[PDB]
Design a protein around this ligand. Structure first.
Ligand SMILES: Nc1ncnc2c1ncn2[C@@H]1O[C@H](COP(=O)(O)OP(=O)(O)OP(=O)(O)O)[C@@H](O)[C@H]1O
Ligand SMILES: Nc1ncnc2c1ncn2[C@@H]1O[C@H](COP(=O)(O)OP(=O)(O)OP(=O)(O)O)[C@@H](O)[C@H]1O
Ligand SMILES: [Mg+2]
Ligand SMILES: [Mg+2]
Lengths: 49, 390, 405, 73, 51
């Protein structure tokens, strides 16, 4: 009951290590940070997050 | 029945020459204008419940489409984003004036009907009204006496002497099409009508009623004729109508079908099922043969006026009119240019006069001369085998 | 060999051939223009009528009507009552353009008068129902119907006897005298397409039908059926036929139906399949897997060769009628009709004028009569004479046959 | 693919919903069954017989189709 | 230094202030009121400020 859902989006541009352009499905495009433990190189243009 | 919109225009100073009488006339116009300006200034310099009513009215009032008014105090309105709300109606609204589809006003937050905004005319059709009045009187149209007579009988006499027609149970023509070669007075005779008319003039170009989306061209035509009928008497001048109205062939594309649909909407407005107010239509065309018969029909276009290339006396009239304001020399006899049996529109004659003036200025002389006119005639006109006949 | 004007040339041409009043005239004209601008600026902007009622009809304390009854209920359509689970209804709502929701009632004094698809009212924050509403009426289709009968009868339509008889049969006799059809066991046609050269009495006959009929008459604006938002035209035609069925006896009058749908061949018309789709829905409504009821259709068109064969099929358009160019008797009758009201001589030969106007339509003849009157006016004469009518014929019909003597 | 009610804010799947059918889809069914005849369509005996087979026979005599190895399109 | 710091602080304030919509004026109906259509939502009649 205390688990707020996320919003699915797609990576687009692969900015600097800590910056990713992500387009939210049926929504706008943001520049977002990545969770530390999530680890990187698994988020390439088109990847679902 | 809002009433004619007209087109404010100042008086005309009869003496075109630069002399004291013209100065006096212009000074009189100016002094009246100055008195008007000072009167307005003095009015505003010598100058509750409604204020609080407007305060209660929403500050950023929104505009929404009323739909299915209910009860006497509750109606369903639309937010112009597809959503619709079962809103209430304050006592401020007129009531007995709301109709479905009317663009009512809604309080921004509580969304209550608080106004009606019965002026939701689209910008595309508000721009195409005439507020100025071009200074092309009928005295600037050399010749074309028969054409002037026809258009006066169609769009002037029915407003200035509306007894002749009622005295014999005749409805005057509601539609005129001015057709002819490229440049003969077709647009001057609409400019002169606009100048001399007390009716709401509505400029349009056939290439303007066509819209990008689906069903928007017909909607624009319907809106145009709706405003032309609210303001009455009104004249709708569709210049170069062969943009929309060309022959109605069996289309294979989608844009062509939409264009023909716009044309059918225009046809229904011109002569449709229900009726037509005191809106008179003037179309203009270079090539009439390519227009659809349903549009040229003599119920939608009662008069068809040809503007042929001017004959000799008309050409002399054109030269007189367009050299009036020119300091013509006494060496110029404007007959050599007339006699030459070559296609000369009034536009060609005006270009000839302008080029003669420019030739004089090039020669450093402010007074034109016969050699200047000859050179201009040779150098302005841009555009059967020998012996095949005779 | 053409010098270019120097500084002195321009400084002398503006100062040598010159009226001693030219500068003053120019300055005064500029002043007049500026003053006109300033006057327009000060008194500019009227008071756009906002709809306010005359005072003393208002009622302050309506701020309390805005604070109470505040709920600006949205309208929602209950598409599923979730079976009502006996108790604990848990209704579902379908707020259009916004979302679907699972909600309940609230102070609904009649929890039974909810039904499905009853267009309930729903609050903004908590979406509980508050009050039901009557079904939607679609104001566009609502005003499509004709209310004021046009002032055209079956006596201003001259030269159309057989066509008038066929149209009268199909459109009126099944409505006012079903006894003969039921007696003979014939189901009369339900659908007429009036076609002919531009201007022959098609829309005039439609107007006469509208005047004579005592039954619903729906003039369908061919432009109102085309819109953006693919599916909107099909929805409008569906709702139109639904309202027609609601009415006891309906007469639709698609005018200039060449606008709504011709051949269905798309090829490059991928962007014009919406009009074809609404036309297909019209076809389905006209005849498909369902009785159509007491709905009779009129369809006017100049060019019934661009139309879809599926639409022209004689199960939807059953009594195609052609308005041909009137014969000599028809033309004489049209002259008589149109000159009845004119102030004319008492010995004009309208048979002669009908002869002089061959291959001419009723609109053409109307134009001839109008121009005859206009010629009389252009001579300060009160009575239009045979000579004026002949001049009008010459001017309208035509605008050398020495090989056809 | 399933219709579940979900909390507005947290968007958490609360109690599930059985099934939803639009009002139009419910009306999308014959209430009063049409009834005229088969003989009331002339000429296309071949087409009517073929359709009757390929529709009805799989519906009623379903078992024999797979018994004989027929795929009822 | 005071001028530099004040410039930065004022920039901070004016930049953290909320943005503003852009609309097209349909018609300057009435004084102090303007019918303006703001994209993409509907059109309002705004009460213009005194500047
Ligand atoms: N009869 C005329 N009297 C005076 N000027 C004329 C006449 N005919 C043409 N002109 C001149 O032609 C120019 C514009 O012509 P106008 O706009 O009437 O042509 P048009 O027939 O509308 O042409 P188009 O088909 O190219 O639009 C102006 O210089 C106008 O003075
Ligand atoms: N048979 C007729 N009898 C009397 N008047 C007629 C007749 N035919 C045409 N008219 C006159 O012509 C006009 C009627 O035209 P109508 O609206 O019927 O044309 P239409 O055939 O529908 O043409 P379109 O669809 O091509 O615009 C009126 O002026 C009417 O007086
Ligand atoms: Mg022109
Ligand atoms: Mg018609």
């Amino acid at each position: 009951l205390q688990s707020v859902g996320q919003i699915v989006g797609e990576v687009l541009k692969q900015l600097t290590e800590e910056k990713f352009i992500v387009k939210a499905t049926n929504g706008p495009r943001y520049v977002v940070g990545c969770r530390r433990q999530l680890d990187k190189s698994k988020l390439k243009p088109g990847t679902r997050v | 029945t809002k009433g004619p919109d007209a087109a404010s225009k100042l008086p005309l100073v009869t003496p075109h020459t630069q002399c004291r009488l013209k100065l006096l006339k212009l000074e009189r116009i100016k002094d009246y204008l100055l008195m008007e300006e000072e009167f307005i200034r003095n009015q505003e310099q010598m100058k509750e419940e409604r204020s609080k009513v407007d305060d209660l009215r929403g500050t950023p009032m929104s505009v929404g489409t009323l739909e299915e008014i209910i009860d006497d105090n509750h109606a369903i309105v639309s937010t112009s984003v597809g959503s619709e709300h079962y809103v209430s109606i304050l006592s401020f609204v007129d009531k007995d004036l709301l109709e479905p589809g009317c663009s009512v006003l809604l309080n921004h937050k509580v969304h209550a009907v608080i106004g009606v905004l019965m002026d939701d005319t689209d910008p595309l059709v508000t721009v195409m009204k005439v507020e100025k009045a071009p200074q092309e009187t009928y005295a600037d149209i050399g010749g074309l006496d028969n054409q002037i007579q026809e258009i006066k009988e169609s769009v002037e006499l029915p407003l200035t002497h509306p007894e002749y027609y009622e005295e014999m149970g005749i409805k005057p023509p509601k539609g005129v099409i001015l057709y002819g070669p490229p440049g003969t007075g077709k647009t001057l005779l609409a400019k002169a009508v606009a100048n001399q008319t007390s009716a709401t003039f509505l400029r349009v170009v056939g290439s303007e009623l066509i819209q990008k989306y689906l069903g928007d061209g017909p909607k624009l035509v319907r809106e145009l004729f709706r405003v032309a009928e609210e303001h009455a008497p009104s004249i709708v001048f569709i210049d170069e109508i062969d943009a929309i109205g060309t022959k109605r062939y069996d289309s294979n594309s989608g844009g062509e079908r939409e264009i023909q649909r716009t044309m059918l909407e225009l046809l229904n407005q011109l002569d449709g099922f229900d009726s037509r107010g005191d809106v008179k239509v003037i179309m203009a065309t270079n090539r009439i043969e390519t227009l659809d018969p349903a549009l040229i029909r003599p119920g939608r276009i009662d008069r068809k006026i040809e503007f042929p290339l001017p004959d000799e006396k008309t050409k002399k009239r054109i030269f007189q009119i367009h050299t009036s304001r020119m300091t013509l020399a006494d060496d110029v006899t404007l007959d050599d240019l007339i006699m030459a049996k070559d296609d000369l529109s009034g536009a060609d004659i005006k270009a000839i006069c302008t080029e003669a003036g420019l030739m004089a200025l090039r020669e450093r002389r402010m007074k034109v001369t016969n050699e200047d006119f000859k050179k201009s005639k040779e150098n302005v006109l841009y555009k059967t085998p020998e012996g095949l006949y005779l | 060999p053409i010098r270019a004007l120097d500084e002195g040339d321009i400084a002398l041409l503006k100062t040598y051939g010159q009226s001693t009043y030219s500068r003053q005239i120019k300055q005064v004209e500029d002043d007049i223009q500026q003053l006109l601008k300033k006057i327009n600026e000060l008194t500019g902007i009227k008071e756009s009528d906002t709809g306010l009622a005359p005072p003393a009809l208002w009622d302050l304390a309506a701020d309390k009507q805005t604070l109470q009854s505040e709920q600006p209920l949205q309208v929602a359509r209950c598409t599923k009552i979730i079976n009502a689970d006996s108790e604990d209804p848990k209704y579902i709502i379908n707020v259009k353009q916004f979302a679907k929701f699972v909600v309940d009632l609230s102070d609904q004094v009649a929890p039974t008068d909810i039904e499905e698809g009853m267009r309930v009212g729903v609050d903004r924050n908590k979406y509980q129902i508050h009050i039901p509403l009557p079904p939607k009426i679609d104001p566009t289709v609502t005003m499509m119907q004709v209310e004021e009968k046009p002032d055209v009868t079956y006596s201003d339509v001259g030269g159309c006897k057989e066509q008038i008889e066929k149209l009268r049969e199909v459109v009126e006799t099944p409505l006012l005298h079903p006894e003969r059809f039921v007696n003979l066991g014939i189901e009369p046609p339900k659908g007429v397409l009036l076609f002919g050269p531009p201007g022959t009495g098609k829309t005039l006959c439609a107007r006469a039908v509208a005047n004579r009929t005592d039954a619903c008459f729906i003039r369908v604006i061919g432009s109102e059926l085309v819109q953006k938002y693919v599916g909107e035209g099909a929805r409008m035609v569906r709702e139109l036929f639904e309202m027609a069925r609601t009415k006891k006896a309906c007469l639709i009058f698609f005018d200039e139906i060449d606008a709504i749908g011709g051949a269905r061949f798309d090829d490059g018309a991928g962007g014009d399949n919406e009009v074809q789709r609404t036309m297909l829905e019209l076809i389905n409504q006209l005849d498909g897997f369902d009785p159509r009821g007491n709905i009779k259709v009129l369809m006017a068109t100049n060019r019934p060769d661009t139309l879809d064969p599926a639409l022209m099929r004689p199960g939807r358009l059953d009594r195609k009628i052609e308005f041909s160019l009137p014969d000599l008797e028809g033309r004489t009758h049209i002259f008589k009709i149109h000159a009845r009201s004119m102030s004319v001589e008492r010995d004009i030969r309208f048979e002669l004028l009908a002869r002089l106007c061959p291959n001419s339509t009723g609109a053409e003849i109307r134009s001839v009569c109008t121009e005859a009157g206009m010629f009389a006016i252009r001579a300060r004469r009160k009575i239009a004479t045979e000579k004026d009518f002949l001049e009008a014929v010459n001017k309208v019909i035509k605008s050398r046959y020495m090989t056809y003597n | 693919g399933d219709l579940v009610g979900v909390n507005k804010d947290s968007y958490l799947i609360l109690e599930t919903l059985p099934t939803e059918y639009d009002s139009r889809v419910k009306a999308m069914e014959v209430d009063e069954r049409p009834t005229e005849q088969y003989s009331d369509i002339g000429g296309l005996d071949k087409q009517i017989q073929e359709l009757v087979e390929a529709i009805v026979l799989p519906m009623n005599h379903k078992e024999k189709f797979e018994n004989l190895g027929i795929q009822p399109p | 230094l005071n001028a530099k710091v004040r410039l930065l602080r004022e920039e901070l304030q004016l930049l953290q202030e909320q943005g503003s919509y852009v609309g097209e004026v349909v018609r300057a109906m009435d004084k102090k009121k303007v019918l303006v259509k703001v994209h993409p939502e509907g059109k309002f009649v705004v009460d213009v400020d005194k500047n």
